[PDB]
UniProtKB/Swiss-Prot annotation:
It is found in: Cytoplasm. It comes from Homo sapiens. Belongs to the Rho GDI family. This is Rho GDP-dissociation inhibitor 1. It is linked to Nephrotic syndrome 8: A form of nephrotic syndrome, a renal disease clinically characterized by progressive renal failure, severe proteinuria, hypoalbuminemia, hyperlipidemia and edema. Kidney biopsies show diffuse mesangial sclerosis, with small glomeruli, hypercellularity, increased extracellular matrix, and contracted/collapsed glomerular tufts surrounded by immature or abnormal podocytes. The modification N6-succinyllysine is found at residue 75. The gene is ARHGDIA.
Length: 138
């Protein structure tokens, strides 16, 4: 039973018509074929939920690499702190970003996420997708 268990990802967006959630205790492979529809231009944050079970973990680091048609277009690392063990889950949020906009920016983006720390531990790695559209449904 890992000291750190990563439980979920939530794409936080006030104008999305419904929750945008991944259960990171579930089947991670299935996410590679799924996507969240996001309206072009909207503000959003990424929330990662996790628990720390037995020992203090230091220098926690959340990494997203974003790809378009299998080519990397962005790398972003976030330092998220030092966390002691407790029963209550922890969460952090990435800083607000905006979905891109315009015909040449619409379509799917893949994101390879890794959650690690000072010891370079692979707490969890997973891949998921966004689909940028003019509208949430059409």
């Amino acid at each position: 039973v890992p000291n750190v268990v990563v439980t979920g990802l939530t794409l936080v967006c006030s104008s999305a018509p419904g929750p945008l959630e991944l259960d990171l205790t579930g089947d991670l492979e299935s996410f590679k074929k799924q996507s969240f529809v996001l309206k072009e231009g909207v503000e959003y944050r990424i929330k990662i939920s996790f628990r720390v079970n037995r020992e203090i973990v230091s220098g926690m680091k959340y990494i997203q690499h974003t790809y378009r048609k299998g080519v990397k277009i962005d790398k972003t690392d976030y330092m998220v702190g030092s966390y002691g063990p407790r029963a209550e889950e922890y969460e952090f949020l990435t800083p607000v970003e905006e979905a891109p906009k315009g015909m040449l920016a619409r379509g799917s983006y893949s994101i390879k996420s890794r959650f690690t720390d000072d010891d370079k531990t692979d707490h969890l790695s997973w891949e998921w997708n966004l689909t940028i559209r003019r509208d949430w449904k059409d």
